[PDB]
Amino acid sequence: EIXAIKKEIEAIKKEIAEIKKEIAXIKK
């Protein structure tokens, strides 16, 4: 279960990283 939790956490970090890229794009 811990492995599956580490899997969901890794996808959340990747999705947040993409959200930060769009915010940086909107700023420009």
CA angle at residue 9 from 1 to 26, to 5 degrees?
A: 160
Q: Is 9 in the site for a second copy (CB under 8 A)?
A: yes
Answer yes or no whether residue 7 interacts with a second copy by CB under 8 A: no
Question: Least distance to a second copy from the beta carbon of 22, Å?
Answer: 6
- At 12, list the tokens: 């959340």
Q: What is the DSSP secondary structure assignment for residue 6, as one 8-state letter? A: H
Residue among 23, 26, 22, 19 at smallest CA distance from 11? 19
Per CB under 5 A, residues contacting Cu ion are 18, 22
Per CB under 8 A, residues contacting a second copy are 1-2, 5-6, 8-9, 12-13, 15-16, 19-20, 22-23, 26-28
